[PDB]
Scaffold this motif. Structure first.
Motif, PDB file in Angstrom:
ATOM      1  N   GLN C  35       0.820  -1.205   0.000  1.00 30.72           N
ATOM      2  CA  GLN C  35       0.000   0.000   0.000  1.00 30.72           C
ATOM      3  C   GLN C  35       0.859   1.262   0.000  1.00 30.72           C
ATOM      4  OE1 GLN C  35      -3.119   0.028   2.965  1.00 30.72           O
ATOM      5  NE2 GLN C  35      -3.151  -2.206   2.954  1.00 30.72           N
ATOM      6  N   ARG C  36       1.948   1.266   0.774  1.00 30.30           N
ATOM      7  CA  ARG C  36       2.845   2.405   0.758  1.00 30.30           C
ATOM      8  C   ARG C  36       3.562   2.538  -0.584  1.00 30.30           C
ATOM      9  NH1 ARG C  36       5.010   0.280   6.351  1.00 30.30           N
ATOM     10  NH2 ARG C  36       3.152   0.822   7.596  1.00 30.30           N
ATOM     11  N   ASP C  38       2.238   1.966  -3.519  1.00 29.08           N
ATOM     12  CA  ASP C  38       1.299   2.666  -4.387  1.00 29.08           C
ATOM     13  C   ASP C  38       1.207   4.144  -4.045  1.00 29.08           C
ATOM     14  OD1 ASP C  38       0.833   0.280  -5.587  1.00 29.08           O
ATOM     15  OD2 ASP C  38      -1.390   0.249  -5.199  1.00 29.08           O
ATOM     16  N   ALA C  39       1.225   4.495  -2.757  1.00 25.06           N
ATOM     17  CA  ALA C  39       0.933   5.857  -2.329  1.00 25.06           C
ATOM     18  C   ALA C  39       2.154   6.743  -2.280  1.00 25.06           C
ATOM     19  CB  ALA C  39       0.275   5.858  -0.949  1.00 25.06           C
ATOM     20  N   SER C  40       3.340   6.166  -2.225  1.00 22.23           N
ATOM     21  CA  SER C  40       4.554   6.944  -2.075  1.00 22.23           C
ATOM     22  C   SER C  40       4.717   7.896  -3.245  1.00 22.23           C
ATOM     23  CB  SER C  40       5.768   6.026  -2.008  1.00 22.23           C
ATOM     24  OG  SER C  40       6.960   6.773  -2.100  1.00 22.23           O
ATOM     25  N   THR C  41       5.179   9.113  -2.943  1.00 21.06           N
ATOM     26  CA  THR C  41       5.488  10.099  -3.973  1.00 21.06           C
ATOM     27  C   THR C  41       6.979  10.380  -4.091  1.00 21.06           C
ATOM     28  OG1 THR C  41       5.066  11.928  -2.447  1.00 21.06           O
ATOM     29  CG2 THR C  41       3.224  11.149  -3.750  1.00 21.06           C
ATOM     30  N   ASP C  42       7.823   9.542  -3.497  1.00 24.93           N
ATOM     31  CA  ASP C  42       9.274   9.659  -3.608  1.00 24.93           C
ATOM     32  C   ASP C  42       9.834   8.375  -4.211  1.00 24.93           C
ATOM     33  OD1 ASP C  42      12.126   9.262  -2.616  1.00 24.93           O
ATOM     34  OD2 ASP C  42      11.794  11.362  -2.068  1.00 24.93           O
ATOM     35  N   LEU C  45      12.294   6.172  -2.047  1.00 24.61           N
ATOM     36  CA  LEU C  45      11.629   5.441  -0.972  1.00 24.61           C
ATOM     37  C   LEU C  45      10.843   4.251  -1.515  1.00 24.61           C
ATOM     38  CD1 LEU C  45      10.810   5.045   1.988  1.00 24.61           C
ATOM     39  CD2 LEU C  45       9.018   6.758   1.581  1.00 24.61           C
TER      40      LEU C  45
END
Ligand SMILES: [Ca+2]
Ligand SMILES: [Ca+2]
Ligand SMILES: [Ca+2]
Ligand SMILES: [Ca+2]
Ligand SMILES: [Ca+2]
Ligand SMILES: [Ca+2]
Ligand SMILES: [Ca+2]
Ligand SMILES: [Ca+2]
Ligand SMILES: [Fe+3]
Ligand SMILES: [Fe+3]
Ligand SMILES: [Fe+3]
Ligand SMILES: [Fe+3]
Ligand SMILES: [Fe+3]
Ligand SMILES: [Fe+3]
Ligand SMILES: [Fe+3]
Ligand SMILES: [Fe+3]
Ligand SMILES: [Fe+3]
Ligand SMILES: [Fe+3]
Lengths: 89, 91, 91, 89, 90, 91, 90, 91, 91, 91
Positions: C35-36, C38-42, C45
């Motif tokens: 889930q992270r 998919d959501a990460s914008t970096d 990371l």
């Protein structure tokens, strides 16, 4: 602890005390940083940000203790901390 | 999973949140596995638990390095204490 | 961490408990990391989160094989469904 | 039940989430039932608890096969270790 | 928060942020002090005790903010802090 | 309720624990009541919630004074910051 | 358990084991049923629905054990199960 | 903090919810404080805990009276049992 | 209190959720009260706990009958096992 | 489930704990059921939920009377506010 203290070695229980301390420090950093973003009172925001950055010091001190008391923490922290270049390499 | 609404949080704050909670969960796994390694009475299971334990430390180290590179005071405070000699509270 | 007093639990039951809760924690980590991812914008990371995610699957797999070797019904049911073709409910 | 807003999660990610949490709950039920089977002092209850326990393993196995078919890394790692002979590590 | 943010005044929400911070600081003080008694490694004990007493400072600063922004915190803290004699009769 | 076995804790540490968790519970009640005071649509209930709220603050202040009298570092830090003027972080 | 095992009768603890098992079965039923509605993968949905309905069988078996081992479960289950008309009127 | 979405709840239901959860929190405080009074080994702290405890009972009683006045079945059932004589079950 | 967004859940699924969690809470109360009945050392309290315990069983039975009338598999499986004789697994 | 070790708690404190926690669970059930009554879209279920709800109030009133009869400060404070007519925050 998840296992009875009777079967845990002394070093394992001290590392547990250190690990859970780092976890609680990390949680405080995250909680404080989110409140710093959301706060609408500048005096409160200054207090929250001040405490936030001292939690990072608290975590760093305890992480150094873990590194000195655990061969695999020392190896893996040596590999990745203070590097340049893609981290997954 | 955030404490404040995402609309008031900076993008970078949310990415650090994602890294911080990851490091927390890795640390929890290190502790959990190390305790189970001490308590297990099956040698084959112990070897698996210990193997996983030490890889969680690698996961934690990698994520912490990202945090260090993307937060100035993580970088400063980690620099003060990591890989030092003598009393930690004196460094 | 056990739901019944250790005094009444067989050794092997507690060892399987250690393995099962380990798989549960690995599975949670896989889900959390995905889930992270998919959501990460970096992107830096995201690559770390994805690297860790996939290693949790390996941790779960090793512990699952230990369960298969130490529990006849895990062996039977995993043999029936894993690595099959066609509808899963009809294996 | 998700940790990130559904707006940013791909559809397949949410379905794998549904499968993963299902396996977790099945694993928890296996562990809970097996402990109660050991502690129970009523043979009729024990037989029921053991029957349910083993069907939970089948529920977990079916859902795990779905994950294997819908996630290349589940397939890779499960293939490495499942149904093998030597030391797992 | 326990109530929708739409019905909470901004100052109520800021006091919430301060109160919960004090709660977490207090919890850290308690956790660290127990670990200080239980630790069997002298270097860890020194770190835990150093962190403990700094959490008390974090709590004190946040409490002063509450005192300055809440008339009843000001009144009750003035009544009881830095007194002598039975605390239940001030 | 303790994080460490009572066998290794000094009596004063356990009594401070009792005071600290009490203050935490008072603080939580203050926050809970204040939010319900803002959200309530019944003035008679609001009057009860606000009354209880302000008495929780007194319960917390009483217990903090006990902490101040029984802990030198609480006494030092509270002396430094309470009832000051000017930037709180610099006092 | 909420009380020390030394003061609990053997039969009370066995009923506890059955009761908590029914609670967990009910939770799985509810969880699976919601995922069945929300799933967008037909192959997964068939698995979730199959598991869901077997949980009901696990609960039913355990509830029968409770009925055979508790006089008031037997009485109340007989009053209301497999009836017609307003449930509150039985 | 509610289990159902606020859009489907009547105003009166949400205010009763605020009162009920308040009473629950007061009851919990009475219980915690009473246990700490028994266990405390510092007489000055014990006097504070016992003072706060008994005021929590007053907070609960005030909020419970509000419920009684705003709910016909609270009023009916509390009238049946409070301040009665003889076996509580048989009243 | 649902795990999936309400917009994708059918009305009947949510109503079944309301019934199921109610039965769960009733079962927990039965267990909690039955343990307290065994452990209580005050006969009048014990009598209240036991009275309440048995009415929770009535609440559960009523709500379970609703589930039976509104779910084909509850009706099938409760029909197979309730009010039977002989080994419960063999029915 | 006590907050202090049972070895240091008086018998009456433990019995009051059993009653207090019982009332808390009854109150929570009243609140949960009342919300489900408002949200339910099935009239047959709503009637059951409402019936159960109102009996939980009876369970709470019976246990609260036990508390009144076995705790001097509960009796004093309940007598001050229960079954009154004037403004609650004015005794
Ligand atoms: Ca801002
Ligand atoms: Ca200000
Ligand atoms: Ca065996
Ligand atoms: Ca046995
Ligand atoms: Ca079957
Ligand atoms: Ca007492
Ligand atoms: Ca009745
Ligand atoms: Ca009158
Ligand atoms: Fe800290
Ligand atoms: Fe990991
Ligand atoms: Fe892992
Ligand atoms: Fe299952
Ligand atoms: Fe702090
Ligand atoms: Fe209070
Ligand atoms: Fe099941
Ligand atoms: Fe209060
Ligand atoms: Fe009930
Ligand atoms: Fe009840």
């Amino acid at each position: 602890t998840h296992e009875p203290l009777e079967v845990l070695k002394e070093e394992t229980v001290n590392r547990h005390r250190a690990i859970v301390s780092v976890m609680e420090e990390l949680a405080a950093v995250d909680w404080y940083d989110q409140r710093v973003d959301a706060s609408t009172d500048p005096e409160l925001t200054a207090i929250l940000a001040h405490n936030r950055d001292e939690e990072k010091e608290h975590a760093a001190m305890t992480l150094e203790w873990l590194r000195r008391n655990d061969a695999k923490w020392a190896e893996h922290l040596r590999t990745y901390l203070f590097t340049e270049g893609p981290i997954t390499a």
